[PDB]
Design a protein around this ligand. Structure first.
Ligand SMILES: CC(C)C(=O)CN1c2nc(N3CCOC[C@H]3C)cc(=O)n2CC[C@H]1C(F)(F)F
Length: 543
């Protein structure tokens, strides 16, 4: 009922363990013994539920008593309770009870996974919420510890417009997943019931909640017309010029296509940006064989929002990685470190198509061909006399920071196929990575480097003996310590992705979380972590 100083130290090690680490029987028995002492440690609760055999009515009953007796757990912690491991309705309702404590700002950072977590919810309880079916026709065809994940997510989506947009598109892609349809019909039936319950709830609401449904419909209808247009252009017989001419021709004909002049609808990619249509003229296809288009949406306040519309490709792997980069950037900023990262938006509108936020930048490879070096590029577009190596100091500070940020982020995520065409640079200093088809240690070539640095990247900083290079190193190990601090949050979100049909996750689902886990080097203390990071940087610039 009360432990001594020796057992308290052992309990503290188990509590500190990664959420994904498997407890030993000895470890499990120690947590169950002093379960009534641990009630004052909110961080211990996750490790406590991990001991229980819910198939045993007595262990299940005993455990739930303690759940209501425990110190209410943090929001990052409750994400573990919504994984495949838990089927107990009272545990799953506990996680939703603690999810309600989060801000909508925080909720959007976890939403992609919260949608995936519905796969582990009670499908009948979702079905009973309702008062062959085309998923993308539900919203475009209207008819005249108490809450679960479905009820909760919908309740919040009605109060928040930004949340509704992502809840909609995330659930529509899930319904659109043909693998899930062929291999898990009960799951597909559930996602349709989520969309059906979403549509139903919006219709019962006030003047604005009712307009939210109309706006989602208008967005679905727009995307649908853009897809049809994409199919026509991709079928067009002729060269890139012939295809661009047909692309510009069809967008221009508003009466026939209805994509250049439309009433203010939110941009699915970033709903805070309202659009009036697509500029026909500036629309061109990227040289790429996948035939993606560059589209300049006319925004609410005269601005131009360039997007990459991809058709005939699955953007869910890039969608996941860019939402994790956005999360890692938000947590770094929270700890007072802004490394000038480009967490550009990516939203799949189907398994077949989706949007990407276009950021005006030049690939490092082109930067090297058109100017000679990163320093030669920065000398032309951002000159300064007093500045380091003739470059504006702000542009150099921005370059050192972003290089440091992406080296750590791309290292933790195991981002492969890292050529200088996949590495983009900005005239303000901003470095960033694109095209995430190879993650979690994958690569098109054997024996890939864990630290993704280049000879020219360092040369752009002004060489290895520079003050900038020291700051690059300093910002690398500092971003590493901060991202290690939020590992319980990062690993729980990746945990909820094991069945999300992401190609590099789908390869070894049972393992994939340990791949990120290992990268953090949780076995090392912050001091060893600092030295390890320096070793990775050292090894990259040498070899
Ligand atoms: C920049 C250009 C040369 C490309 O590499 C195009 N490009 C591309 N640009 C991206 N950027 C562009 C800059 O802003 C951020 C994101 C949206 C992201 C991304 O995944 N790709 C994939 C390869 C090609 C494709 F055209 F096929 F899509």
């Amino acid at each position: 009922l009360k432990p001594n100083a020796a057992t308290r130290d052992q309990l503290n090690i188990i509590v500190s363990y990664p959420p994904t680490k498997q407890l030993t029987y000895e470890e499990q028995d120690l947590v169950w013994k002093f379960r009534y002492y641990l009630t004052n440690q909110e961080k211990a609760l996750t490790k406590f539920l991990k001991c229980v055999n819910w198939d045993l009515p007595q262990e299940a009953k005993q455990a739930l008593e303690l759940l209501g007796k425990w110190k209410p757990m943090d929001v990052e912690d409750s994400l573990e309770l919504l994984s495949s491991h838990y089927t107990n309705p009272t545990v799953r309702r506990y996680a939703v009870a603690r999810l309600r404590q989060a801000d909508d700002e925080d909720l959007l950072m976890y939403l992609l996974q919260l949608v995936q977590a519905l796969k582990y919810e009670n499908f009948d309880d979702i079905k009973n919420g309702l008062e062959e079916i085309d998923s993308s026709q539900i919203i475009t065809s209207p008819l005249p510890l108490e809450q679960d994940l479905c009820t909760f997510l919908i309740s919040r989506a009605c109060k928040n417009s930004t949340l509704a947009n992502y809840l909609y598109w995330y659930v529509i892609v899930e319904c659109e997943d043909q693998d899930t349809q062929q291999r898990d019909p009960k799951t597909h039936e559930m996602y349709l019931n989520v969309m059906r319950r979403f549509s139903q709830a919006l219709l019962k609401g006030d003047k604005s909640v009712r307009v939210m449904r109309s706006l989602l419909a208008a967005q679905q209808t727009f995307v649908d017309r853009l897809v049809h247009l994409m199919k026509a252009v991709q079928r067009e017989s002729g060269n890139r010029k012939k295809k661009n001419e047909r692309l510009q021709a069809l967008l221009g004909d508003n009466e026939k296509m209805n994509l250049s002049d439309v009433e203010l609808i939110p941009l699915p990619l970033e709903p805070q940006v309202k659009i009036r249509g697509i500029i026909p003229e500036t629309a061109t296809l990227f040289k790429s064989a996948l035939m993606p288009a560059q589209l300049f949406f006319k925004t609410e306040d005269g601005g131009k929002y360039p997007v990459i519309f991809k058709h005939g490709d699955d953007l869910r792997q890039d969608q996941l990685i860019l939402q994790i980069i956005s999360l890692m950037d938000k947590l770094l900023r929270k700890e007072n470190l802004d490394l000038k990262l480009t967490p550009y938006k990516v939203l799949a509108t189907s398994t077949k198509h989706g949007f990407m936020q276009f950021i005006q930048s030049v690939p490092v490879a082109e930067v090297l061909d058109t100017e000679g070096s990163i320093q030669n590029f920065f000398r032309k577009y951002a000159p300064s006399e007093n500045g380091p190596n003739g470059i504006s100091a702000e542009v150099m500070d921005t370059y050192v920071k972003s290089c440091a940020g992406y080296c750590v982020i791309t290292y933790i995520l195991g981002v492969g196929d890292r050529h200088l065409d996949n590495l983009l640079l900005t005239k303000t200093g901003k470095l960033f990575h694109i095209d995430f088809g190879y993650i979690l240690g994958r690569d098109p070539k054997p024996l890939p480097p864990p630290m993704k640095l280049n000879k020219e990247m360092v040369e752009g900083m002004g060489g290895t003996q520079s003050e900038q290079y020291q700051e690059f190193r300093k910002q690398c190990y500092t971003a590493f310590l901060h991202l290690r601090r939020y590992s319980n949050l990062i690993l729980n979100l990746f945990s909820l992705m094991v069945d999300a049909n992401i190609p590099d996750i789908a390869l070894e689902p049972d393992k994939t979380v340990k791949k990120v886990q290992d990268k953090f080097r949780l076995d090392l203390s912050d001091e060893e972590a600092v030295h390890y990071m320096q070793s990775l940087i050292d090894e990259s610039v040498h070899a």
